[PDB]
Symmetry: C3
Subunit: 370 residues, 3 copies
């Protein structure tokens, strides 16, 4: 069971957990309630297992996409903010945390992938994806690579796949068609083909995960990377003269990244819902609260209006927001996990050569649909 | 008819329309709703013509004085903010936008006139009006004039007229007597006589309008001007070492400027009232929203408390406030258009010599009353 | 009777009254309502006398401890803020201003006592009280004293008393036992004994009041002092290189200061309750309002969320919080005046030698209980 009188919080490792722990400490000082901040491996998979039994954390942090499915699975409590608190945040962020006409999580920040480049190694970043092979030929001679990013999570190769015309589920007449999946189309195929051609032409490596790509960029080995705001902290630590810009185009089309909204959900099994509400509304969703988390690892474009001016003029944030506009806010619909798992398998097998782009993407399309 | 699915905004040319257009752009990004910002000539006269037919803008920007009349004419929608949003603004600003117990517009900023002077040509501005003729003589020798302001709008002449006793309508027992007008009294007569004597003693020119004065002050031709916050932008551009101070006194009495509250009204014929509400409450009446507009042309003392410490410590603002406090917030009552037209005619004819101060002001008093 | 149409405010002589007067001036400039700010001697005693008759101030400022008693005496109006305004402040601060399920005052700031030391005289301030006598011997050689604080108010000698075991009233099962008083226990006795031993060993003076101490610290005569945020202003004026730190430990136990919340109450006899509400909610409890008061004399840790960041990163404030966390927020229960009066007598008589620590504290325990 979940311990009453205290608060357990689960948040991802790539995020500002130590910052969030300080907020929890600040909350314990005023209230005398212990706040434990954990970062379990594979928490997005782990949570729905434990929550079903009545165990797990009091509060769950993840991007809105996994939230609709949890709500459908009857794992999330219905959040009850008054119009006063709701007005403190951007309505579009509230739309992201709504499932079945109910508010299921608290929106924290809008996170988007951006083109991060070494200003010293590359003063002018490429406007197109197409010019990247030529650019790596130049850098390879200098024992450096043009670009490196996570090829183990579909979230990173997604703005490329979507740039042309690749898509998750079709949105028409105010709803998503769960049977209409666009991970098999000409646009999706062209996108992933280009990526596999890069690996094939010794421009990228299929094995490249989150860490390896970060190490390479932060150590100056690679001139470019694809990542979100959270990454910026370690890039600062590395003292690399870096710029955060708009992602490269593909077939004259802008890259369309899947935009996530960091959200905080309350476990329906929690006997500490009112405390969870108090911590989220009065301690985290405050300018002091976000400052603490943002100083650890950057949140991106925050949902809290009162904290806009403090980040609104950072070019990194402006560049993130440009990509956000070029991309699309992810659906929260329960089918998203099925979609992600299907694309994860498709990208991995195509990159490794285990399956053809065409065969793998075809399987994904079937697997993503019910 | 008014186009549904989009917003049309009318605002005065002296205000920050390009700044407001950026807010509209920011609103289109998040919502996908086009926001057109227009600045028609004579919009305060133009709006009630078009609104009566069912056409015109979705949102109208003007000072609160014209709003009560529009509301009575059945042209303005009743604004519906929740106590949460209402608390974000100064209650006195809300009082200005209330007509017949209904909130008929959104208060933006408190605007008052100040005496703006060239620090190089005049290091010590006159405390009194009575000392401007002598000061003008000294400056004429140096090929310059002491003071120049718009003599075509009674707004700029009113602080002098109201100084020793002029008034629009008598306020007693919580209401205005529409039959009791004070544009004819000894104080109103003394005030306008002094102004006409200045023109008569070649210290001012009856022809001088807003731009003639703007040019003369910004080009260094005149040592003083009478204007509002909106003007400051062009004075900055001109690189004139300027100070914004308290208006001169007349007969030891302070100048009494008619204080205006820039307000945003929703056209009752608009099929986009909910969008208009969303734009005004969530996009403009925000620290980011006001910043955008204020950076184009200064708003004055804003109605939004959260924004105050960003303009509060500006000495120009302190002077706008000194003047505002010495003056009186304009009534919104319908007979304000009638009053303004009557005084405009009175000021013009007295300045031009076409009519005597006494004859013109007597006519005004009759014309202003029903 | 209380004058109708104008506000009268009473606030303590050690607080930022001139700052508060500026807020009142700002309120008069927008509303045309005169705001008189007074600081009467012994106002916490004076108010309940005059309020009972129907006279006194419109608004009373004091720490929350005296308010519960005033409310019971039927002197305070029930404050009516909407959830929107209530959310602008920390809920724990609202708990302090609640008596009998009614909100009886507005919470302004959290004030606690800290150890203030001369960095030039003392580079590393003592971590324990036990090392103070030895410290003093060294400073006497340099013609200085180690520590000086007000021995005329139990508020300053209370962190020492409470440290090893002292307490006002026992809190169990969500309520205070008014018959169970802990001013007589082993911990309370040890604490006050140590203080009397300091006076006895010519390390402190029984006569020392607030000003005697303020002067000695600010003139460089004493290396240490015990005071609250309000004091900082004059220490700045004195140009003494000072640090604000955690209070010394006693028997390895932290000093437990009785934490106060500066609160604003509305006199139940006032005919200006709505004006009082408007001034408190829209003028003082704003970032501009607390800036004004704070600039005069520092408030401490404010209840208003939006202003936190301005004072949050001040090390003096961090030390105020550090100590407050070690201490306990005072009860507001009507027996509090009975407690303070009883302890005041006990401390005075023990210090002066008039009574033994044991005899005086025993009398206090009886006197504090009903
Ligand atoms: O890649 C599958 C995965 O994509 C997204 O995950 C992101 C997350 O949103 C980011 O903020 C950061 O944590 O990195 C992850 C990618 O490694 C979806 O939100 C997630 O549900 C999905 O399964
Ligand atoms: O002059 C008559 C006029 O006075 C005010 O108009 C002001 C307006 O308030 C300002 O925003 C600025 O733009 O200058 C105008 C002066 O031309 C009243 O608001 C108005 O209704 C009245 O006609
Ligand atoms: O010492 C007895 C006294 O302590 C507290 O008073 C504090 C007050 O809270 C502060 O605002 C500051 O001015 O100093 C006071 C000490 O004089 C209690 O709040 C008070 O009721 C009590 O009598
Ligand atoms: Cl705010
Ligand atoms: Zn800004
Ligand atoms: Zn300020
Ligand atoms: Zn901060």
């Amino acid at each position: 069971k979940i311990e009453e009188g205290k608060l357990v919080i689960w948040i991802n490792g790539d995020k500002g957990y130590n910052g969030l722990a300080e907020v929890g400490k600040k909350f314990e000082k005023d209230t005398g309630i212990k706040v434990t901040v954990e970062h379990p491996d594979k928490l997005e998979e782990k949570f729905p297992q434990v929550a079903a039994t009545g165990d797990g954390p009091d509060i769950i942090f993840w991007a809105h996409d996994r939230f609709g499915g949890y709500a459908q699975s009857g794992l999330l409590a219905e959040i009850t903010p008054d119009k006063a608190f709701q007005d403190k945040l951007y309505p579009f962020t509230w739309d992201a945390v709504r499932y079945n006409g109910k508010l299921i999580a608290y929106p924290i920040a809008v996170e988007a992938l951006s083109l991060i480049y070494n200003k010293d190694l590359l003063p002018n970043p490429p406007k197109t994806w197409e010019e990247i092979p030529a650019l790596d030929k130049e850098l390879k001679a200098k024992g450096k690579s043009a670009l490196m990013f996570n090829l183990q999570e579909p979230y990173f190769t997604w703005p490329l796949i979507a740039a042309d015309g690749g898509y998750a589920f079709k949105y028409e007449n105010g709803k998503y068609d769960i049977k209409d999946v666009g991970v098999d189309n000409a646009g999706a195929k062209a996108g992933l083909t280009f990526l596999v051609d890069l690996i094939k032409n010794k421009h990228m490596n299929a094995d490249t995960d989150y860490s390896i790509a970060e190490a390479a960029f932060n150590k100056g080995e690679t001139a470019m990377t694809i990542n979100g705001p959270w990454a910026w902290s370690n890039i600062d630590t590395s003292k690399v003269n870096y710029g955060v810009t708009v992602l490269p185009t593909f077939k004259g089309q802008p890259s369309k990244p899947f935009v996530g909204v960091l959200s905080a959900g309350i476990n329906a099994a929690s006997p500490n819902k009112e405390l969870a509400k108090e911590f989220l509304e009065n301690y985290l969703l405050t300018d002091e609260g976000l400052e603490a988390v943002n100083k650890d690892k950057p949140l991106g474009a925050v949902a809290l209006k009162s904290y806009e001016h403090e980040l609104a003029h950072d070019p990194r944030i402006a560049a993130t927001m440009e990509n956000a506009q070029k991309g699309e806010i992810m659906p929260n619909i329960p089918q998203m996990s099925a979609f992600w798992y299907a694309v994860r398998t498709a990208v991995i097998n195509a990159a490794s050569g285990r399956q053809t782009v065409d065969a793998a993407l075809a399987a994904a399309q079937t697997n993503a649909a019910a």
